[PDB]
Design a protein around this ligand. Structure first.
Ligand SMILES: Nc1ncnc2c1ncn2[C@@H]1O[C@H](C[C@@H](N)CC[C@H](N)C(=O)O)[C@@H](O)[C@H]1O
Ligand SMILES: [Zn+2]
Ligand SMILES: [Zn+2]
Ligand SMILES: [Zn+2]
Ligand SMILES: [Zn+2]
Length: 270
């Protein structure tokens, strides 16, 4: 509460909303911010991306260690504050919604991720050339990011993490650590790019994982029929698809790749 009465002082000094929207959960322990930054190995060469800097507790700690930091904030009066409370030489504040703005070239991400964009952000970052990302998420979501094929909570997000990243939950972060207290705990999650990425088709993975409890012949038939295609013209091919004897939530990325390659061969995704 050295940082929490610092928060309260800033919130009141400018008049900023108690919980801005569902719940903006600002990070307020020095321990946690420093462990994020040390897991990241933020050196003076790095160029860092932060999403949602809030009152900039993490931002300022990143700014004194990295060459440059680009930080993306939706609230315009958080920015107006950031400009006044701080005097960074090496920070570019970027107004916008982190899902929609053009990202910088960066080699690292260290961020307290906004919960409502946890999934879109994860999918965007996963298709970026970064060496190391250290991102706090809600723990339920961080568990889905490391879930394994055939596990119940294995999903699009799981598959795409395993296809493209090395993902580690470093350690739980208690709700105590943010104001206001979330109703659930968080996790310090580490992502590095998989040295040998399995590049899958976005639209095919999306198709498959609308209903993941479905078998993959069923999954495929439904998704392509819904596109407008004749259900007659499509059954034979899709019946003979590789790994037809799995449900979609059982697929390893490699098994999704064979399915793509088969559909590519039979003209179905082109
Ligand atoms: N889509 C978004 N793009 C950029 N900044 C955002 C977005 N959504 C929320 N923010 C900002 O995120 C800052 C603080 C957030 N890191 C807190 C999020 C919190 N950890 C949560 O799990 O909900 C605030 O200043 C918000 O304005
Ligand atoms: Zn749930
Ligand atoms: Zn580690
Ligand atoms: Zn029909
Ligand atoms: Zn198989």
């Amino acid at each position: 509460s050295k940082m929490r009465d610092r928060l309260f002082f800033l919130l009141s000094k400018y008049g900023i909303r108690p919980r801005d929207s569902i719940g903006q959960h600002f990070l307020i322990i020095e321990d946690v911010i420093e462990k994020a930054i040390e897991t990241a190995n933020v050196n003076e060469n790095d160029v860092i991306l932060e999403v949602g800097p809030g009152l900039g507790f993490l931002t300022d700690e990143l700014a004194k260690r990295a060459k440059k930091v680009y930080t993306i904030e939706i609230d315009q009066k958080i920015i107006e504050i950031l400009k006044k409370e701080y005097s960074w030489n090496n920070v570019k504040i970027i107004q916008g919604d982190a899902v929609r703005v053009e990202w910088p070239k960066f080699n690292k991400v260290v961020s307290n991720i906004p919960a409502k964009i946890s999934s879109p952000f994860t999918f965007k970052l996963l298709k970026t050339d970064f060496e190391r990302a250290v991102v706090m998420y809600q723990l339920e979501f961080a568990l889905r990011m490391v879930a394994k094929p055939g596990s119940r909570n294995y999903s699009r997000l799981s598959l795409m993490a395993q296809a493209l990243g090395n993902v580690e939950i470093v350690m739980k972060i208690g709700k105590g650590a943010f104001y206001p207290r979330p109703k659930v705990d968080s996790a310090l999650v580490l992502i590095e790019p998989r040295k040998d990425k399995i590049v899958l088709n976005e639209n095919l993975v999306k198709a498959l994982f609308q209903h993941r409890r479905k078998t993959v012949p069923r999954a495929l038939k439904d998704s392509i029929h819904m596109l407008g295609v004749s259900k007659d013209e499509i059954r034979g091919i899709i019946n003979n698809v590789p790994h037809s004897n799995k449900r979609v939530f059982q697929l390893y990325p490699e098994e999704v790749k064979d399915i793509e390659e088969y559909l590519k061969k039979h003209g179905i995704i082109s």
